[PDB]
């Protein structure tokens, strides 16, 4: 159950979250702060793509007789130019923004992984599949303190060192 392996489907509370395993209990959880930042950011981006557009009262359809052929050709040319520029700009813009959205989400995952790794530098063995297996045994307050960001090294340092010596 790691991020390199795939994506979880049980949790829907946030885009980003932790899975905790304990003797007392086992379940999923979600990082409200990280997800809230990201949801706000994506909302702002979508609003800017749709809102910055401001339409005015324009008439597109024009009528010209047989004598005014140059005017009809000019109107066709300017309409074709506008639609071609709009198509090219919109398609390249949406492709680039999709790539930014995926890149930003991956960067959020890597930032969360590096944060929890910097907090658990050597107290927990790293599986490499996205799982941090604790050497030291600690209950649910320990894991939610890891979620809280208030985990401390010296409290479980000696037990972790003994568990390294055992393995």
């Amino acid at each position, epitope marked *: 159950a790691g991020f390199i392996e795939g994506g979880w489907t049980g949790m829907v509370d946030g885009w980003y979250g932790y899975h905790h395993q304990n003797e007392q209990g086992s379940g*999923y959880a979600a990082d409200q702060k990280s997800t809230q930042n990201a949801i706000n950011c994506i909302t702002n981006k979508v609003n800017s793509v749709i809102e910055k557009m401001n339409t005015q009262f324009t008439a597109v359809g024009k009528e010209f007789n047989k004598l005014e052929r140059r005017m009809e050709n000019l109107n066709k040319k300017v309409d074709d130019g506008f639609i071609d520029i709009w198509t090219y700009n919109a398609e390249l813009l949406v492709l680039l923004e999709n790539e930014r959205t995926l890149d930003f989400h991956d960067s959020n995952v890597k930032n969360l992984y590096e944060k929890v790794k910097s907090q658990l530098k050597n107290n927990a063995k790293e599986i490499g599949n996205g799982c941090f297996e604790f050497y030291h045994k600690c209950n649910d307050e320990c894991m939610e303190s890891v979620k809280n960001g208030t985990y401390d090294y010296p409290k479980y340092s000696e037990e972790s060192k003994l568990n390294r010596e055992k393995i």
Partner: antibody
């Protein structure tokens, strides 16, 4: 629109298991979290705890963490509250509600829309 | 954790008036807020989510805005059904505490 119906004992002695069962009609335990809200008489609302999915995500209040345990069973289609060591301060109107609102595919945390009509319970002699 | 305050505590207004209710928060909650109105003895219902948007099935007379530590809810025309109490809720972290509540009354 989902319909929420809750059943309660209506009376509870001090210091035993207090259990209420909330049933939902027209909805399932899929992609929507479910939570419990209680209000004391004449005081404001507060959040006891929330379950989401089918037993996957469990959230509890820090003050009531040891006291409340949330259990679900989709086959019978109810979610229930289990409370031990009940006190006189627990006299409240229990509300069960659905975390039905969502933005960009996430279920916003703890923003409730449709609740139940309420089941009153008092702790007394 | 994130303490919630409301102002004014009690307000009275007539039918058709404009009333602004300002719930205030101890620490920045960004744009995340829930507004609930509670009829006496009935289930509270959702009014405003994200402090700027309207949930469907709510009349469009209600409007909310604000950012930072200060937020406002503005009602354009206040009818008889809107005289119930109102609540302010934050949704960024546990515990998800609620506002003390603001009561509305005729004159």
């Amino acid at each position: 629109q989902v319909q929420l119906q809750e059943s309660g004992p209506g009376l509870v002695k001090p210091s035993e298991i207090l259990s209420l069962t909330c049933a939902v009609s027209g909805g399932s335990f899929s992609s929507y979290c479910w939570g419990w809200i209680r209000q004391p008489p004449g005081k404001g609302l507060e959040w006891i705890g929330s379950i989401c999915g089918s037993g996957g995500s469990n959230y509890l209040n820090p003050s009531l963490k040891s006291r409340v345990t949330l259990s679900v069973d989709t086959s019978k289609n109810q979610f229930s509250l289990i409370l031990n060591s009940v006190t006189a301060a627990d006299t409240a109107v229990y509300y069960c509600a659905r975390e039905g609102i969502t933005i960009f595919g996430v279920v916003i945390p703890r923003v409730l829309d449709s609740w139940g009509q309420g089941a009153v319970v008092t702790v007394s002699s | 954790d994130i303490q919630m305050t409301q102002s004014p505590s009690s307000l009275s207004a007539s039918v058709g008036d404009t009333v602004t209710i300002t719930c205030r928060a101890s620490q920045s909650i960004s744009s995340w807020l829930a507004w609930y109105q509670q009829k006496p003895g009935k289930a509270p219902n959702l009014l405003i989510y994200r402090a700027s948007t309207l949930q469907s099935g709510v009349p469009s007379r209600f409007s909310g805005s604000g950012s930072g530590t200060d937020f406002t809810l503005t009602i354009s025309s206040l009818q008889s059904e809107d005289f119930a109490t109102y609540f302010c809720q934050q949704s960024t972290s546990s515990p998800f505490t609620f506002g003390p509540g603001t009561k509305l009354d005729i004159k």
